[model samples]
Target: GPASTSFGVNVFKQMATEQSGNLAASPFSITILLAMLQQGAAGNTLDEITRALQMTPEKSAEIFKKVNEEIQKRNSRNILKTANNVFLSENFNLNPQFKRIAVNNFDSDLTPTYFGKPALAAQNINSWIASKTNDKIDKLVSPDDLSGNTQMVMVNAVYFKGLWEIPFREQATQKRNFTLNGGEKKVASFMQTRRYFKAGTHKPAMAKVVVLPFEYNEYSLIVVLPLKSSNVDALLSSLSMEDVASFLDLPPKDVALELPKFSIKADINLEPVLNKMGVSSIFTQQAELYNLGSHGSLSPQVSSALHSAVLTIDERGGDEPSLYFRANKPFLAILWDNRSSIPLFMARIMDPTLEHA
Candidate 1:
């Protein structure tokens, strides 16, 4: 699991650098998808997946199961839904062992499809994603993205929507100047509240964090504000899981807070990023997937690793309470699970004007 979280942070860093402003991703989904894909791996291919996932062959599957079980446990107390599916080409016979493992441990379904009609196949998969993600992500794969050469498609979708335990009054919200990373300023509607929430200051990372829990106290949104000359990039780069643990030292206190409500959707082609993270074997002929029952020239390459996510945090308060913790600037938001301390989604909001970007 550490391997998955580490890979996620690495991806976050790159996404931040390239997008230059806002970014979001399902770290859980990516890790689980790759872990499933690792089952068919062997030799160097197996080695790379193992390296990236940070698990050995004997333990990879079990670890993934434990993680999935933990996720379900969290979902029991929160607004979270996740689904995984694998669609195989009708033309090719699948490895029974892999299918059994997927169905049994991961609770994923492996179905047969006609990849010769790429449009139809893509449509079917996209529809499944829409249903699983509550229509928040409708088009993860397009007709133009698949082809007759496609052999199999595996997908993971997750949807989460939780109400804050401590809500801010809409009447208290007002227009405030939000500073961009480059020192540019823009007017945005910022919600202010004087509520008792967990707050902390990380002197080592030059950052401050505020934790706002969701209903039932199962989940929370952690906002990290970097101080001085360091923007979010500098602060995030220096952070580790241990550093993240330190950020949770926040003591409960009533503090003045100003936060912006924004919605961001990110569609990413994760292949390039995966390649950069030493996962190139899966995208080339050098891949070995005999475990998936392929013989001869059936060596399959991943054409794409598509991901999309949507997050909205609006004026949703409890009783009013002292210190002003104004977040009228660029900051990092971590949607995290309090039970296991796992980061569900991480984003850096430089500007709130682009609701769909």
Candidate 2:
């Protein structure tokens, strides 16, 4: 089916649209659909690294076909292509062109702004991403002048650390009865606090919104209302954009947002999702977007982009993973906010060997 043609592209597009409030799936929407291709010839660990280096759609598409041969192979970067097409899309044009400095690695200019300052934690994450993606997203230390010469190379670890706006005190916290499906109960430590939020009283889900502030109000943790009235499955199917946006508009007051301070460390390989999204080209050399780079200083980049994410929702807030949730099938979804330092986009991806609800 065409729906399954661009597996990762569909996943990335839907998740990005949902996050940015683009429900219509408008034209020219800047979205990078990604999730680890966990099954078939591919596995999460290998795809995680491949996604980081997949610089072009053609490369990504090629990789995806190799991973899943049962699926038909195509040559083009539509919504569906190869597994890694989004990583290197000519039309997407993803780069932090330097008004201040050029690049050190490519001996040219136009690297992402995050590359210049290694002291910042974002740069460290960027460095780890470089290692993980094989440096398709280059990491460099800015020189005092504009010469763009430096020997410093860094790892791009892609971090997502966040502190709750109203943090839970270590002493004030205790084990509480958490309701699980099938009437089973478990004792999970829920962080408690008196914080302002945008809440509502839905029939199935009692709404609670939390605004976890970041460095500045320009960026924030806008967690929508979690369903307190039903299981995650019911909550996911019944959710609407209005419900999520309404939750983000929580008023200024002191209430509380208690969440289990847990982190998910998964090696996300996004090829499978791309196949489902309709992006079936660009995975092979057949993809024709390799003419992106210009002449002289900047040659065309034939990169194979692959990346992984480690999201930690802790006491302190971070600039990563805008929206995250689990459906009956663990529907994890979020995107790397590259505009911000902590750019990470993730989707709920369990072992496909399991089930897809």
Best by TM-score: 1
lDDT for model 2, on a 0 to 1 scale?
0.33
How much lDDT does each candidate structure score? 0.73, 0.33
The digit string of per-residue lDDT tens for model 2 on 51-109 reads 43343334443443332332123221111111122122222333343211122111122
Tens digit of per-residue lDDT, candidate 1, span 1-357: 234456666776776677576777777667666777788778888888888878665565786666666666653334576667777666667778888878766656666777778888888888888887778878878788777777666676666667778677889889988888777889999988777778867777788778888876777788888886677888877777566655566678777788887877776778888888888888787777667656455755555667666677876622344445778887888887666667777777878867654
Q: Which regions of candidate 1 are displaced past 4 Å?
A: 1-4, 74-77, 295-297, 317-323
Each prediction's TM-score against the native? 0.90, 0.46
Query: Roughly what TM-score does model 2 have, to 2 decimal places?
Result: 0.46
lDDT at 257, model 2: 47
Clashes of each: 2, 84
Alpha carbon lDDT at 170, candidate 1: 85
